[PDB]
Structure formats: structure tokens, C-alpha cells
UniProtKB/Swiss-Prot annotation:
Species assigned in the record: Homo sapiens
Modified residues (Phosphoserine): 163, 170
Binding-site residues for substrate, renumbered to this chain: 196-197
Active-site residues per Swiss-Prot or TrEMBL entry: 62 (proton donor/acceptor)
Outcome of mutating residue 195 to E/H/R: Strongly reduced CO(2) hydrase activity
Site (Involved in the binding of some activators, including histamine and L-histidine): 90
Reported impact of residue 117 to D/N/Q: Reduced activity
Name by which UniProt lists this protein: Carbonic anhydrase 2
Outcome (variant: residue 92 to Y): In OPTB3; partial loss of activity
Residues annotated for Zn(2+) binding in this entry: 92, 94, 117
GO molecular function term, any single one: cyanamide hydratase activity
Function summary: Catalyzes the reversible hydration of carbon dioxide. Can also hydrate cyanamide to urea. Stimulates the chloride-bicarbonate exchange activity of SLC26A6. Essential for bone resorption and osteoclast differentiation. Involved in the regulation of fluid secretion into the anterior chamber of the eye. Contributes to intracellular pH regulation in the duodenal upper villous epithelium during proton-coupled peptide absorption.
Length: 258
């Protein structure tokens, strides 16, 4: 009954409707810091979010998405391993029921409390739906969250969550600046992978920042009060909406830093 994160519809079941779940470039993966190799040729990342235009925040029954106007080159990601320009379309998070779990990527098997995904699509393919059909169609910037001090730039998100508690609810979310979600450093790891939710398409260049951001226990607690279910249905807390690490197979993770 439709994919999700429960025992009966979660990641171990997805391959039955989405056989690519057992494919050759699936995500997330464990990042072994002792095996990833510094790649001198990797350029600095270029994150150009000054003109970002956020529109709306939506509870889609799996996570919540903050959506952006991507009709023009307003907020873009360039550089690093990428050729060409990738437009920001949305961001969302994955998080746990407990502070010791929640991220999708792991670092030397360490799980973080949550993981932010800023999703961008390659403008050479004209639209997002065409881009997801291409091996170089998407670039997702992944940022780990640990519990510590509050992240001021996240609070606007946390405070609107009460208004999108259940699946299908949305709220206006204009004038949000995603630059407030970044850590200081843009050092990263990169590897070719996939969407981490169905349809699990193998269209993503992953760029995972090495420095986590800190959020407060109160901030992540509010994530955990969201609901997977729709209004009027039995309450199922939106927690543990993460896919575990998948086999690396014939892939190398490259580091931008020594
Ligand atoms: C694949 C798309 C739905 N999924 C996503 O957009 C998506 C993005 C990022 C991740 S992650 N967790 O890996 O960062 C996972 C899922 C549906 N879809 C198909 C065609 C299409 C056209 C326009 C809009 C949506 C469209
Ligand atoms: Zn994601």
C-alpha cells in the first residue's frame, strides 16, 4: 500500500515496485573517510543562493519540502565535480526518532540526527522531469545535522511546521534564505548515486559537506511532531524517514580536501 518507511512498506520492500533499488549506483552510502581519496582536480563548490525565491512548504507524507521558483537561474549550484549549472528546486530533510539516528549518509558508520538535501537540476535538460532521466541530471547538496546549539537560519522552518502537520498540507513560505542552513566550510565528498526515495532514479551527483550544522534539541523535536498521515486519520509520527546505507559497488568517493 504505497511506499513509506514502516515495517510493511519501508526500504526493504521498495525493490518490488522499484527494482532499481538493487541497482549499481544507489544512495545513500557510508562514507569511509580512510578510503575516500582527495582529488586535486576538484574545484571549489559555487553556491549562488543570493537570488533564491522560496514559495511554499509542503508535507508530502514522507518529509516536508521547501519549494523554490526554478523558472530562471535564481539559486544555482556550480563548480566542484559539476559541469554546467544546476538550479535549486527544493530542499527537505531526513531525521530520526532519537538523536543517534536519522541521516541517510553515514561517515565511518556514524549516523547523524538528521540530513538536509538541497536538490538541484541540470539546466541543460530544460526541466526537472527530463533531468531525472539523465545520469547527470541532478546535483544534491547533503548537509548533516547534529544536536547542539540552535541553528538560527532553521527557526523559520521549525515555526511553520505546526501549520503543515499532516500529509497534503502546505503553507506560504516566501522570502526564506537557504544560505542560513549552510555550515562555514564547503569542503565535501562526492560520488555518483541516486534519489534516496522511490523512484530511486540513478540521476544524482552527490555532494556531501564534511562539516555538519548544529541544531537544537527543541528544533529537531519539532520535526518529530509532524505526521506521515493525513488529517483525520490515525496519528503516525513522521520520524525515521531515512533509507539506510546501500552497497557502494563499483564507485569511488572523492574528497575535495586533504
Ligand atoms: C522524482 C520526483 C519526486 N522525487 C524527488 O523529486 C526527489 C528529490 C530528491 C530526493 S533525495 N532524498 O535523494 O534528495 C528524492 C526524491 C517526481 N517527479 C518526476 C518527474 C517530475 C517532474 C517535476 C517534478 C517532480 C517530478
Ligand atoms: Zn532526501
Amino acid at each position: 500500500h504505497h511506499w513509506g518507511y514502516g515495517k510493511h512498506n519501508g526500504p526493504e520492500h521498495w525493490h518490488k515496485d522499484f527494482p532499481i533499488a538493487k541497482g549499481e549506483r544507489q544512495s545513500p552510502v557510508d562514507i569511509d573517510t580512510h578510503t575516500a581519496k582527495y582529488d586535486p582536480s576538484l574545484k571549489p563548490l559555487s553556491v549562488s543562493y543570493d537570488q533564491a525565491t522560496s514559495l511554499r512548504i509542503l508535507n508530502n507524507g514522507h518529509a516536508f519540502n521547501v519549494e523554490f521558483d526554478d523558472s530562471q537561474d535564481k539559486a544555482v549550484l556550480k563548480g566542484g565535480p559539476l559541469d554546467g549549472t544546476y538550479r535549486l528546486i527544493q530542499f527537505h530533510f531526513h531525521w530520526g526518532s532519537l538523536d543517534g539516528q536519522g541521516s541517510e549518509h553515514t561517515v565511518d558508520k556514524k549516523k547523524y540526527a538528521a540530513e538536509l538535501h538541497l536538490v538541484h537540476w541540470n539546466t541543460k535538460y530544460g526541466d526537472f522531469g527530463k533531468a531525472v532521466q539523465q545520469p547527470d541530471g541532478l546535483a544534491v547538496l547533503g548537509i548533516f545535522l547534529k544536536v547542539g546549539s540552535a541553528k538560527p537560519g532553521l527557526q523559520k522552518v521549525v515555526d511553520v511546521l505546526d501549520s503543515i502537520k499532516t500529509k497534503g498540507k502546505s503553507a506560504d513560505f516566501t522570502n526564506f534564505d537557504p544560505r542560513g542552513l549552510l555550515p562555514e566550510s564547503l569542503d565535501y565528498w562526492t560520488y555518483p548515486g541516486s534519489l534516496t526515495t522511490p523512484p530511486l532514479l540513478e540521476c544524482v551527483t552527490w555532494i556531501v559537506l564534511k562539516e555538519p550544522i548544529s541544531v537544537s534539541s527543541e528544533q529537531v523535536l519539532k520535526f518529530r511532531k509532524l505526521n506521515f498521515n493525513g488529517e483525520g486519520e490515525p496519528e503516525e509520527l513522521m520520524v525515521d524517514n531515512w533509507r539506510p546505507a546501500q552497497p557502494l559497488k563499483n564507485r569511488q568517493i572523492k574528497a575535495s580536501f586533504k
